[PDB]
Design a protein around this ligand. Structure first.
Ligand SMILES: *[C@@H]1O[C@H](CO)[C@@H](O[C@@H]2O[C@H](CO)[C@@H](O)[C@H](O)[C@H]2NC(C)=O)[C@H](O)[C@H]1NC(C)=O
Lengths: 218, 221, 152
């Protein structure tokens, strides 16, 4: 059995996006399908339902008329056409199979789920990060501040992947600006500070930034 | 419509002990008579990133392959998910769900972590970089490294005046090996204001510390 | 009091319970399931199928008008009014050995209520009688005054 969601990235408020779910391991053409979203927070919310033949499609009141559920049984694929997107639609969209037997009314029991696809709606355009060092002053702490970037994510490695132990990369914090700020740190022995060269290698693919900054002691 | 509320927000139990999540519905989800009494309630396990899985349905029936340590229980309005003997693998978020009325609704879910011995945080302060100071902004950072429990108080102090609203916190997920947390506290100030003050301090209050710990610097340096 | 009847084609029969309208179709498709849905035992369970109380009675008349004996005959399955799928009441009228007899019952009853009724059922194949309140999502376009003009 397999459900693999595809599509979904970052969109500007008001634009459109299309999500697809590839299904295998069951009789797709006979089972009822669903779209359930998980907003950054905790809440798991139902979005849409579709019958084996598309005759009966039902939407949650939040999305009703903006979204459109469709399916292609020949390709065993489920679709959600999302238009007139809003910030409130920011969520991980999971595609799920209803436990309801063939031609039976929807049981609202979600037997199988896919890994989910992230959909981010924000008016913030793509911006590269500014990387400043967190200069050290029997163990010492070194770091990198990765301030003002969009969208997520950013990848931090130390000494180009050589430095691994005691690396703590904190989750991104969204600022008032609508831009993300992230911090990365590493604990190193005090004795090595004079000898060893410490460089964090920051990588933000959407803005195509690659930086690598050396952290020099005070 | 139906509101599922789950409690407690996150719990931590030692390896092997019993875990107990509570779920409460705003309206009964029980259908009775014939002979049959069914409870239209389901339980789900969601580990990080991974596909959420169906555990229990009919509030007590185990989905094929779910180990017997998972016990679904309750009736009408109050439900409980019990993990008889917690395993490292069982660390996840658990959601309860109602399917008695349309639309189907879910809980906020409990997060299940491991309960370990107290671990004091190691405290570190960092002044804003000159690189950033020429940029027109200033960022003072405070690190609390490898500690347990997650609960700790970070207070920022600029020239002995306490700071509020101007700071932001970030916390790592419980570590895979030692199951400790780490915390980042970022005090964000205008270049202007930063240059007008001298003492910058960060005060940590934790279970593992005998007394509050203070990490501070002067602007003069 | 009596609910006025009417038919359009071979699988399109109608009923009007005062103000409310109800669509009666035959299906081969087992839409409602046992163990998931509300079994109707007595006429009082019927109120759990319709938003209204002044609906319940017209249904109750028709079911008994068909030949349904509440005391012995098998409970009809119904879709709860909690599910926003609509209001659906179905009778297990299958030509399968179990509900073989009940099948003959409701069918003779139909042939008596509606002059234009013919047995659409297949021998040794599932057969159901589906009813939907007009205005409901499950009743669809069929309840529009376009199909309902052709009737009394
Ligand atoms: C409606 O009635 C039919 C006939 O009794 C049911 O179908 C039979 O179900 C039993 C048990 O599952 C089987 O042994 C028979 O082989 C089935 N008969 C047919 C026609 O194939 C049907 O299940 C009833 N409706 C539901 C969904 O409960």
């Amino acid at each position: 059995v397999q459900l693999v969601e595809s599509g979904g990235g970052v969109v500007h408020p008001g634009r459109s996006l299309r999500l697809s779910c590839a299904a295998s391991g069951f009789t797709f053409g006979t089972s009822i399908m669903h779209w359930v979203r998980q907003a950054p927070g905790k809440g798991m919310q139902w979005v849409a339902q579709i019958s084996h033949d598309e005759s009966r499609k039902f939407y949650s009141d939040s999305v009703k008329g903006r979204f459109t559920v469709s399916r292609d049984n020949s390709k065993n694929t489920l679709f959600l056409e999302m238009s007139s997107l809003r910030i409130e639609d920011t969520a991980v969209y999971y595609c799920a199979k209803d436990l309801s037997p063939p031609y039976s009314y929807a049981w609202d029991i979600f037997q199988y789920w896919g890994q989910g696809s992230l959909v981010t709606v924000s008016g913030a355009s793509t911006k590269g990060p500014s990387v400043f060092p967190l200069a050290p002053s029997g163990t010492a702490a070194l770091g990198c501040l990765v301030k003002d970037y969009f969208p997520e994510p950013v990848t931090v490695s130390w000494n180009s992947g050589a430095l691994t132990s005691g690396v703590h990369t904190f989750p991104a914090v969204l600022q008032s600006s609508g831009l993300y700020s992230l911090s990365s740190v590493v604990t190193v022995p005090s004795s090595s500070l004079g000898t060893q060269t410490y460089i964090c290698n920051v990588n933000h693919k959407p803005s195509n930034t690659k930086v690598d900054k050396r952290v020099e002691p005070k | 419509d139906i509101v599922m509320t789950q409690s407690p927000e996150s719990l931590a139990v030692s390896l092997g002990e019993r875990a107990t999540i509570n779920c409460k519905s705003s309206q009964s989800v029980l259908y009775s008579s014939r002979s049959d009494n069914k409870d239209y309630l389901a339980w789900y396990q969601q580990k990080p990133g991974q596909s959420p899985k169906l555990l229990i349905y009919w509030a007590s029936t185990r989905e094929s392959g779910v180990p017997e340590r998972f016990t679904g229980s309750g009736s009408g309005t109050d439900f409980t998910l019990s993990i008889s003997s917690l395993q490292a693998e069982d660390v996840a978020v658990y959601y309860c769900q109602q399917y008695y009325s349309s639309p189907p609704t879910f809980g906020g879910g409990t997060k299940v972590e491991l309960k370990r011995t107290v671990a004091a945080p190691s405290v570190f302060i960092f002044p804003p970089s000159d690189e950033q100071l020429k940029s027109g902004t200033a960022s003072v950072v405070c690190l609390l490294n490898n500690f347990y429990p997650r609960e700790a108080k970070v207070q920022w102090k600029v020239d002995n005046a306490l700071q509020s609203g101007n700071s932001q916190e970030s916390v790592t997920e419980q570590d895979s090996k030692d199951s400790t947390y780490s915390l980042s506290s970022t005090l964000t100030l205008s270049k202007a204001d930063y240059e007008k003050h001298k003492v910058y301090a960060c005060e940590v209050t934790h279970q593992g510390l005998s007394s509050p710990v203070t990490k501070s610097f002067n602007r003069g340096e | 009091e009596l609910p006025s009847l009417c038919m359009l084609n071979n699988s399109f029969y109608y009923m009007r319970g005062g103000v409310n309208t109800f669509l009666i179709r035959v299906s081969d498709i087992s839409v409602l399931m046992k163990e998931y849905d509300v079994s109707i035992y007595e006429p009082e369970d019927l109120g759990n199928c319709l938003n209204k109380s002044d609906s319940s009675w017209a249904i109750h008349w028709f079911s008994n008008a068909l030949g349904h004996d509440w005391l012995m005959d098998p409970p009809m399955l119904c879709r709860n009014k909690t599910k926003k799928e609509g209001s659906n009441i179905q009778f297990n009228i299958s030509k399968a050995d179990d509900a073989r007899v009940y099948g003959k019952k409701i069918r003779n009853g139909m042939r008596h209520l509606f002059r234009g009724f013919h047995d659409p059922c297949e021998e040794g194949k599932v057969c159901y009688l589906t009813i939907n309140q007009c205005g409901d999502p499950s009743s669809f376009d069929y309840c529009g005054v376009n199909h309902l003009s052709k009737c009394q």
